[PDB]
Amino acid sequence: RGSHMKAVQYTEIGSEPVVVDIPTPTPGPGEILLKVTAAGLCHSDIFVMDMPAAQYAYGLPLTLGHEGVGTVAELGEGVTGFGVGDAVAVYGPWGCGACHACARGRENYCTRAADLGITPPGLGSPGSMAEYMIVDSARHLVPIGDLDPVAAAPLTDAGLTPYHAISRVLPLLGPGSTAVVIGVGGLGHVGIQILRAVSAARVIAVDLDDDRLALAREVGADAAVKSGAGAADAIRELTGGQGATAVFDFVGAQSTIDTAQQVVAVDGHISVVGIHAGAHAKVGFFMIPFGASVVTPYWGTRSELMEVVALARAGRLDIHTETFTLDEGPAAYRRLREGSIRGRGVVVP
Amino acid sequence: RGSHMKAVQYTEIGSEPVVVDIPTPTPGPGEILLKVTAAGLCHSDIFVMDMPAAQYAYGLPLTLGHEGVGTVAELGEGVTGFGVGDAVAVYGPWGCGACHACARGRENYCTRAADLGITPPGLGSPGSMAEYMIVDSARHLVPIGDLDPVAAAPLTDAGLTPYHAISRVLPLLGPGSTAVVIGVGGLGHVGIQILRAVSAARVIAVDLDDDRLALAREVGADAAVKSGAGAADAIRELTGGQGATAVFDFVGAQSTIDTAQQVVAVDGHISVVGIHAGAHAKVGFFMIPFGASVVTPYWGTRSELMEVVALARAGRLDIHTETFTLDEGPAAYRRLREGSIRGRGVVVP
Amino acid sequence: PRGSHMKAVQYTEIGSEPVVVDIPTPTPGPGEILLKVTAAGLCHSDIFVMDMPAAQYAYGLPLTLGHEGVGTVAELGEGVTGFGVGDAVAVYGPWGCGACHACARGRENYCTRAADLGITPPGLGSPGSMAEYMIVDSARHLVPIGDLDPVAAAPLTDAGLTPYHAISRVLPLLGPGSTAVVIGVGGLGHVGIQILRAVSAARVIAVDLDDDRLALAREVGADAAVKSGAGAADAIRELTGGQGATAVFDFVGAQSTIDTAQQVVAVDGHISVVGIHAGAHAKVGFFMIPFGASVVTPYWGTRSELMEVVALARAGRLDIHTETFTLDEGPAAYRRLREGSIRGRGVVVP
Amino acid sequence: GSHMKAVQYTEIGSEPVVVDIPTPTPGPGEILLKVTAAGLCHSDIFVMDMPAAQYAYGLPLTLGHEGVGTVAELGEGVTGFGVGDAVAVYGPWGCGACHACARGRENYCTRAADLGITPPGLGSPGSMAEYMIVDSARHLVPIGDLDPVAAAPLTDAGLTPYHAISRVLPLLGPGSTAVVIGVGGLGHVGIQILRAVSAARVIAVDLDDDRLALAREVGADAAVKSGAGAADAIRELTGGQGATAVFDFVGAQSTIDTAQQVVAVDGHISVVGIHAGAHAKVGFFMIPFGASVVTPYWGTRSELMEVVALARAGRLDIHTETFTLDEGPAAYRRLREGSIRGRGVVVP
Ligand SMILES: CC(C)(C)[Si](C)(C)OCCC[n+]1cccc(C(N)=O)c1
Ligand SMILES: CC(C)(C)[Si](C)(C)OCCC[n+]1cccc(C(N)=O)c1
Ligand SMILES: CC(C)(C)[Si](C)(C)OCCC[n+]1cccc(C(N)=O)c1
Ligand SMILES: [Zn+2]
Ligand SMILES: [Zn+2]
Ligand SMILES: [Zn+2]
Ligand SMILES: [Zn+2]
Ligand SMILES: [Zn+2]
Ligand SMILES: [Zn+2]
Ligand SMILES: [Zn+2]
Ligand SMILES: [Zn+2]
């Protein structure tokens, strides 16, 4: 290959990411080096890059990109289970692999990763927005077969994170139930499709743009209303006043969380997936229906990633993507900031 | 170190185990070498050694011992998570670590281990009944802290196997439920202790031996019944004719399974944990109550082994142990055939 | 078909960008075929047409764009025999009259009556493929593709057929020991290299502007690559020992690249001006070009050539990079094409 | 190989590109080298920024005037080297027969311009290619088992400061002071040279604080920030005496002005760096008495041998970032933005 590789890095606090030529890494024992085939942009990348110097703690420079797919380039010493050339997706939320949470497969909830300094690619470790990347262990590689890399990259976060949020309360979403999806962006437009595939719940979408509402219907939403002060009333108009069994808020604004608490049913669920600084649900007596649980989920488990890949291979996921080159990385992040990307932006080296 | 080590091996079909000298293994990348501190014996070892030569195809010589505990002696290249001297128990039912069952933590139900020739230590792979043993991966080590290795060794099987069987239907064993334990020696004695620690179910002990029944009461059995033809009516007399929510048959004989089907409640459960060749539950309409599920569980999950270790370290699990030296290995196995071991035999190199 | 209305992208008024529209689903008349479009490719020729002033433009509005069509047979017009419903087919672009001497020879792209009769290609006068359904005038303008990926097949109708025809016009000259120069390694050029390696033993030397493009040319099969410009001709002659190139395939078409082609083409060679740059032209006269070096501006390709292009693609000999778009994303995709932000060839998938 | 890859400057205002050209063959007296290391430096950026009128090096140009390699083929009649010998390339080629050349100062050859003799990578084919031609055996300096990547910067980053210092080395005895303006690149090596071949006090001057801290690690006894106050700070460190020698590796008008304000009586100013139009103004009352000024050019062959001896003794330490030949143009972009710490070196 080449001694150097193109990469999109966050180098200075408050500055836009830059395209640089950095050394090509080599896999240590147990590690795997991949030739990246597609790297996705996530709105949480903007959040990280918008943190002040006091809060930012992911080191500089940082190769961005935690939505990674690639082909096995080089196997580290003792790495069996994958051959060179195998198409694989990168399981992002790396854990210690030995705590109680990790042994259950829930590595995203590892209780020792923070103490041990184990961070995901693109969020502390070198990310996938580069020609090559290192993966710490073979257990963080999931085969994708002949899936198109551009549509496979979002599965690692844009599919895995909604899939996990939905899975936490899937038994509540039988026939007759209603699931409200707020935000029809990169995550939400996949979350709608997941709901249609693993449940018989009625899906009501919520967003601000008429194009986002049309996208929601395009991907299986049974109904779509506009976000705002009237969103709660519009939803309850469609449910006959009953209230939604579950509300998946992929925006995370205080106004969207407020709408969630106004429409969630008794014994229901609100999932705050989107990140807005300071926004929070208010879980207290007479401020939220009885028994309606609230949680901020984080990414997903490894088996959930394999299930998401299985959904894609069965044709149940229609991922909307716009392709960029590595040199267009910083330009793509400007596009994502202004909300000009319909769906998920993906960089292809 | 030392170039060679003693090991108790099954060397030819129909023969007794012998203490032989073999090379001390060295850990390759990803592997871990343990200095064995305790190696348990159980009747499953006998069942394997009684396997006929006609059935045999490969596997000799075989170092015995699937109930292994030790201290980390040397780390293979790239291994992280443990240091030299760490006390760890060996997770028995090794799996591929990459299938859906493995990613969920249920390696004992790995769907690829058979095809890939992945076998447990002491049942296809070199076991713990030796001065040193190789463990294929760090994920098959569970820390035990300062727990006595002799007390920890039976937990790898005698504790894990009943704990998994109970765990499969634990949500059914709330207050007001009844759990029947057939065979209160060996694993049943541990099962009773587990049931009192993780559930409020009423426990009914069933066994042939009067002495065993009294000791079952000491560890929590609320009632005792003599196994046999009258066991079913005796059990129904205790439950008021409503049946037992769950029946854990640790004998596995046809007569005890027959008793289980006659006492299991509607929508209950029967777990066939003991193994008697040919014995089987007959699950059909009007031969078993409606909704009463039956299963033959296998060993347990890694996270379950951690929970079993947590119970022991909390003082909730005590298994009587008879200690032998490595040279007494073959003698202990002869003692096991004649049932002369009270408790669980443990070899301490 | 199924549905009286269908989605489409149309060029509706001069100087304005294409728009997504809702228009009626067409019905196949006698001799016609209705296709459910599976892939419709974009190319810069669409930009050139939409950049034509009001006076020059003579292709009729509104115009469903898309002259690189692939789809499945949806309905057979009366009397149409030769295809079954569901058959995957590519759309032959340069429609001709089918009755003149050129058409009878298989060279419909050089039909001498099409202009008089108003016969225009899909997306360049007739309704194109950038819609859920499209009409094809005749069964002879359909080429089967089998199980070939429609997205991979769509560029073959232009990005494959056009370089293939240019090379085929002088293929007998490209024997072992010959040298073929490829100027421009973009959409058509890098397909031209793959074609040259598959159907000839010629040495391929590439010319382009970017270190990235020169590296790509070497990756696709070029033996050597040099930077475009005033020194391009001398750089090529350095690699050939000063002999000159048997054929130069100029896929850029600028005056500078044509000048390079005339400075590097060998005696009795050939220059094919394939790229379009308004006003650019070769100057074929004594002392301005070597003896016997013919120059031509080829147009698209023949139907038998498109069949050969499909055979190459189905055998794994043709690899074209692609990016897919939604029908709604049609106008946005053309914006990308204007700014040159599309790597490879764009394809709309209804 | 009938043809080879080479990083070339092919037209004015354009960026360097990797292009295929014929593999050269050595004529009588010439030597063919398999390149093992080819250094990049800002002088290449300066040459490529030359407008059309000034550039007189001819196109296309294989870049790379900091060349190292192994002898691959000897032209007819070439004795003194064997196939496989590791050698650095002496850059400033001369005629070899004029008075300056006969004294060893080929860099100051008086007939090279009239005869059209140009250095590799600056008029003649450079080293940034798989193979390169060296016109004569006397333009090869053996390096022994020296790492070729470490040898390549010595051909310019070591030779040029070494020559500039050597021109007035007898002045730099104990008690003397040497001011180095511009610590990056050549200046970093100049400081190391000053500590190795002299006992002079070294005052590092630069605009970047991080570069100044690195100067102190290699031997600088004091650090000053370039600017309007640099002259006062330097004279604060030396008292009112001034600096015996000022080696200006930036060459800007401001840095030259600072040099004229701090140089001591009977001292020396060496304008090593190039900024178009910048010049010292040597006149009465505009510079101390007896303070000589010169623009030195590269170095002599014996000086290159001495630089190699310094490197092989562990006295010279240049940080190197290694690039492949295909990454040549990429490495040049990083040099334009000063993103390379130390020196870039291409390894075919
Ligand atoms: C694989 C063997 C045939 C050797 Si078995 C399953 C008799 O013992 C292995 C050791 C684990 N263990 C022991 C007893 C019972 C069970 C069970 N209920 O699965 C598991
Ligand atoms: C060629 C024309 C200028 C007449 Si136009 C803008 C109608 O091209 C569309 C026909 C497709 N195609 C694309 C590129 C080149 C050629 C070619 N070498 O003819 C043909
Ligand atoms: C400035 C020159 C006209 C000599 Si230039 C940009 C053609 O240097 C190339 C020769 C290498 N080098 C680099 C830096 C300085 C010098 C020097 N002061 O001699 C020489
Ligand atoms: Zn994310
Ligand atoms: Zn963990
Ligand atoms: Zn056992
Ligand atoms: Zn498995
Ligand atoms: Zn086209
Ligand atoms: Zn015709
Ligand atoms: Zn230099
Ligand atoms: Zn001379």
PDB file of N, CA and C in Angstrom, chain B residues 293-325:
ATOM      1  N   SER B 293     -43.324 -26.413  29.725  1.00  0.00           N
ATOM      2  CA  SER B 293     -42.190 -26.593  28.834  1.00  0.00           C
ATOM      3  C   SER B 293     -41.169 -27.541  29.449  1.00  0.00           C
ATOM      4  N   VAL B 294     -40.432 -28.231  28.582  1.00  0.00           N
ATOM      5  CA  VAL B 294     -39.394 -29.167  28.994  1.00  0.00           C
ATOM      6  C   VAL B 294     -38.137 -28.869  28.190  1.00  0.00           C
ATOM      7  N   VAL B 295     -36.983 -28.955  28.848  1.00  0.00           N
ATOM      8  CA  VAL B 295     -35.709 -28.670  28.206  1.00  0.00           C
ATOM      9  C   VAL B 295     -34.622 -29.477  28.898  1.00  0.00           C
ATOM     10  N   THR B 296     -33.585 -29.821  28.134  1.00  0.00           N
ATOM     11  CA  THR B 296     -32.342 -30.351  28.685  1.00  0.00           C
ATOM     12  C   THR B 296     -31.294 -29.247  28.601  1.00  0.00           C
ATOM     13  N   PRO B 297     -31.037 -28.504  29.674  1.00  0.00           N
ATOM     14  CA  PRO B 297     -30.055 -27.418  29.594  1.00  0.00           C
ATOM     15  C   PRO B 297     -28.634 -27.956  29.538  1.00  0.00           C
ATOM     16  N   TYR B 298     -27.712 -27.074  29.150  1.00  0.00           N
ATOM     17  CA  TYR B 298     -26.303 -27.427  29.002  1.00  0.00           C
ATOM     18  C   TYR B 298     -25.445 -26.392  29.719  1.00  0.00           C
ATOM     19  N   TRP B 299     -24.776 -26.821  30.789  1.00  0.00           N
ATOM     20  CA  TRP B 299     -23.769 -26.019  31.498  1.00  0.00           C
ATOM     21  C   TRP B 299     -24.371 -24.644  31.793  1.00  0.00           C
ATOM     22  N   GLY B 300     -23.682 -23.545  31.492  1.00  0.00           N
ATOM     23  CA  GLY B 300     -24.228 -22.223  31.726  1.00  0.00           C
ATOM     24  C   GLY B 300     -23.439 -21.176  30.971  1.00  0.00           C
ATOM     25  N   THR B 301     -23.874 -19.929  31.118  1.00  0.00           N
ATOM     26  CA  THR B 301     -23.241 -18.799  30.454  1.00  0.00           C
ATOM     27  C   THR B 301     -22.138 -18.215  31.330  1.00  0.00           C
ATOM     28  N   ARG B 302     -21.261 -17.431  30.701  1.00  0.00           N
ATOM     29  CA  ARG B 302     -20.165 -16.816  31.442  1.00  0.00           C
ATOM     30  C   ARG B 302     -20.693 -15.867  32.510  1.00  0.00           C
ATOM     31  N   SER B 303     -21.636 -14.996  32.140  1.00  0.00           N
ATOM     32  CA  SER B 303     -22.218 -14.086  33.118  1.00  0.00           C
ATOM     33  C   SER B 303     -22.871 -14.848  34.263  1.00  0.00           C
ATOM     34  N   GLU B 304     -23.417 -16.033  33.986  1.00  0.00           N
ATOM     35  CA  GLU B 304     -23.975 -16.851  35.058  1.00  0.00           C
ATOM     36  C   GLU B 304     -22.878 -17.367  35.980  1.00  0.00           C
ATOM     37  N   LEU B 305     -21.722 -17.732  35.419  1.00  0.00           N
ATOM     38  CA  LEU B 305     -20.610 -18.174  36.257  1.00  0.00           C
ATOM     39  C   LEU B 305     -20.149 -17.055  37.182  1.00  0.00           C
ATOM     40  N   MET B 306     -20.118 -15.818  36.677  1.00  0.00           N
ATOM     41  CA  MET B 306     -19.801 -14.683  37.536  1.00  0.00           C
ATOM     42  C   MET B 306     -20.803 -14.562  38.674  1.00  0.00           C
ATOM     43  N   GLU B 307     -22.091 -14.714  38.366  1.00  0.00           N
ATOM     44  CA  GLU B 307     -23.108 -14.654  39.407  1.00  0.00           C
ATOM     45  C   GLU B 307     -22.935 -15.792  40.405  1.00  0.00           C
ATOM     46  N   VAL B 308     -22.600 -16.988  39.918  1.00  0.00           N
ATOM     47  CA  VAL B 308     -22.344 -18.110  40.817  1.00  0.00           C
ATOM     48  C   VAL B 308     -21.162 -17.797  41.726  1.00  0.00           C
ATOM     49  N   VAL B 309     -20.109 -17.194  41.169  1.00  0.00           N
ATOM     50  CA  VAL B 309     -18.968 -16.793  41.986  1.00  0.00           C
ATOM     51  C   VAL B 309     -19.386 -15.733  42.995  1.00  0.00           C
ATOM     52  N   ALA B 310     -20.267 -14.815  42.588  1.00  0.00           N
ATOM     53  CA  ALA B 310     -20.736 -13.783  43.509  1.00  0.00           C
ATOM     54  C   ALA B 310     -21.479 -14.396  44.691  1.00  0.00           C
ATOM     55  N   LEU B 311     -22.307 -15.412  44.436  1.00  0.00           N
ATOM     56  CA  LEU B 311     -23.016 -16.079  45.525  1.00  0.00           C
ATOM     57  C   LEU B 311     -22.036 -16.725  46.499  1.00  0.00           C
ATOM     58  N   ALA B 312     -21.030 -17.427  45.970  1.00  0.00           N
ATOM     59  CA  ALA B 312     -20.067 -18.109  46.830  1.00  0.00           C
ATOM     60  C   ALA B 312     -19.298 -17.112  47.687  1.00  0.00           C
ATOM     61  N   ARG B 313     -18.818 -16.028  47.074  1.00  0.00           N
ATOM     62  CA  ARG B 313     -18.087 -15.016  47.824  1.00  0.00           C
ATOM     63  C   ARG B 313     -18.975 -14.288  48.825  1.00  0.00           C
ATOM     64  N   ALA B 314     -20.287 -14.262  48.598  1.00  0.00           N
ATOM     65  CA  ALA B 314     -21.224 -13.672  49.545  1.00  0.00           C
ATOM     66  C   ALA B 314     -21.637 -14.640  50.646  1.00  0.00           C
ATOM     67  N   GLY B 315     -21.134 -15.873  50.628  1.00  0.00           N
ATOM     68  CA  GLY B 315     -21.468 -16.845  51.648  1.00  0.00           C
ATOM     69  C   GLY B 315     -22.759 -17.595  51.424  1.00  0.00           C
ATOM     70  N   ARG B 316     -23.358 -17.491  50.238  1.00  0.00           N
ATOM     71  CA  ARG B 316     -24.631 -18.138  49.947  1.00  0.00           C
ATOM     72  C   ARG B 316     -24.473 -19.529  49.346  1.00  0.00           C
ATOM     73  N   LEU B 317     -23.269 -19.903  48.921  1.00  0.00           N
ATOM     74  CA  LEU B 317     -23.024 -21.189  48.280  1.00  0.00           C
ATOM     75  C   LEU B 317     -21.868 -21.880  48.984  1.00  0.00           C
ATOM     76  N   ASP B 318     -22.128 -23.067  49.525  1.00  0.00           N
ATOM     77  CA  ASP B 318     -21.090 -23.902  50.115  1.00  0.00           C
ATOM     78  C   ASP B 318     -21.280 -25.324  49.613  1.00  0.00           C
ATOM     79  N   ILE B 319     -20.234 -25.878  49.007  1.00  0.00           N
ATOM     80  CA  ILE B 319     -20.238 -27.238  48.485  1.00  0.00           C
ATOM     81  C   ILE B 319     -19.128 -28.000  49.195  1.00  0.00           C
ATOM     82  N   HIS B 320     -19.492 -29.080  49.881  1.00  0.00           N
ATOM     83  CA  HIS B 320     -18.490 -29.877  50.573  1.00  0.00           C
ATOM     84  C   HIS B 320     -17.512 -30.472  49.568  1.00  0.00           C
ATOM     85  N   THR B 321     -16.229 -30.443  49.917  1.00  0.00           N
ATOM     86  CA  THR B 321     -15.166 -30.847  49.010  1.00  0.00           C
ATOM     87  C   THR B 321     -14.221 -31.803  49.717  1.00  0.00           C
ATOM     88  N   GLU B 322     -13.872 -32.891  49.038  1.00  0.00           N
ATOM     89  CA  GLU B 322     -12.801 -33.779  49.464  1.00  0.00           C
ATOM     90  C   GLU B 322     -11.589 -33.502  48.581  1.00  0.00           C
ATOM     91  N   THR B 323     -10.465 -33.172  49.208  1.00  0.00           N
ATOM     92  CA  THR B 323      -9.279 -32.733  48.487  1.00  0.00           C
ATOM     93  C   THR B 323      -8.346 -33.908  48.231  1.00  0.00           C
ATOM     94  N   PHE B 324      -7.803 -33.957  47.017  1.00  0.00           N
ATOM     95  CA  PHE B 324      -6.821 -34.952  46.620  1.00  0.00           C
ATOM     96  C   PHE B 324      -5.610 -34.242  46.033  1.00  0.00           C
ATOM     97  N   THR B 325      -4.470 -34.926  46.057  1.00  0.00           N
ATOM     98  CA  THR B 325      -3.283 -34.446  45.369  1.00  0.00           C
ATOM     99  C   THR B 325      -3.320 -34.894  43.909  1.00  0.00           C
TER     100      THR B 325
END
